[PDB]
Amino acid sequence: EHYIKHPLQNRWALWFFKNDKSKTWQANLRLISKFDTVEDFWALYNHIQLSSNLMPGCDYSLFKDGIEPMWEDEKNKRGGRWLITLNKQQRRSDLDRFWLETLLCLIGESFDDYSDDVCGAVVNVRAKGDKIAIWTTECENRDAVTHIGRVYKERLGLPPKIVIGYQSHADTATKSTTKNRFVV
Ligand SMILES: Nc1nc2c(ncn2[C@@H]2O[C@H](COP(=O)([O-])OP(=O)([O-])OP(=O)([O-])OC[C@H]3O[C@@H](n4c[n+](Cc5ccccc5)c5c(=O)nc(N)[nH]c54)[C@H](O)[C@@H]3O)[C@@H](O)[C@H]2O)c(=O)[nH]1
């Protein structure tokens, strides 16, 4: 009846975004819960919906405690994201897998000397095509951004034929195509 808890390096918060066009974007975001142990992560993951079962327009976000999953956050305003784009068939094939490995990538501190630059990750469930992104705190840190993208792409088994791009939040938020600051 003894249950050991394995600590994580950081405390993490899972966020949920609901699809509702009658409310503003900020009003559709809500905090689910937080955790800082391996056991509490799986407890949360095992009782929430899989990403492939979300209604279109919904998001999941896992960010470090104190960072909100929005581009106006103080830890995100100068940063950016490595973006992955999936087709419709990739949803049943790879969406749930890619998201779980992403979650374990985050909470495992798998980015060597640049783990502190990581802010979180977001998965968007969209009818036009699902997206998964890992957010970093500073888009001008070339060593941090390129290292995080290389580790992330390899840890998710993506073939080298597919090229993933990094984009600044400030550039994305003012888009009137969002150019890539880096490619891996
Ligand atoms: N009323 C109502 N309308 C909604 C709602 N959701 C969509 N629409 C409208 O629906 C139509 C079709 O687009 P869509 O279905 O493709 O939504 P999308 O596919 O999600 O596109 P998006 O990603 O361009 O986001 C679209 C807009 O969402 C707001 N947004 C998104 N992020 C997350 C975010 C963070 C970093 C990088 C990129 C994104 C943030 C953020 O961090 N901080 C703030 N302040 N705003 C953020 C912002 O305004 C953005 O321009 C369009 O007219 C939409 O405006 C809604 O909740 N309510």
Residue numbers in the entry: 32 to 207, 210 to 217
Please quote the authors directly:
In addition, the cap fulfills numerous other biological functions that are mediated by specific cap-binding proteins and include maturation, transport, and eIF4E-mediated translation initiation. Upon binding the cap, the eIF4E protein changed its conformation from open to closed, bringing the Trp102 and Trp56 closer to the cap, and together with the structural water molecules, stapling the ligand with the protein structure. Finally, to gain more insight into the consequences at the molecular level of N7-benzylation of the mRNA cap, we determined the crystal structures of three compounds with eIF4E.
In the 1a–eIF4E complex the residue was flipped by 180° compared to the m7GpppG–eIF4E complex, but still participated in stacking interactions with modified guanine ring (the distance between the Bn7G plane and the parallelly aligned aromatic ring of Trp102 was approximately 3.5 Å). In the case of the benzyl modified cap 1a, for which the benzyl ring was directed upwards, most of the structural water molecules were conserved in the cavity, while for 3-MeBn7GpppG and 4-Cl-Bn7GpppG the benzyl rings were directed downwards into the cavity, and the structural water molecules were replaced by 3-methylbenzyl rings or 4-chlorobenzyl substituents. Specifically, backbone carbonyl oxygen atoms of lysine 54 and 52 formed hydrogen bonds with N1 and N2 of guanine, respectively, and amide group (NH2) of Asn59 was a donor in a hydrogen bond with O6 of guanosine.
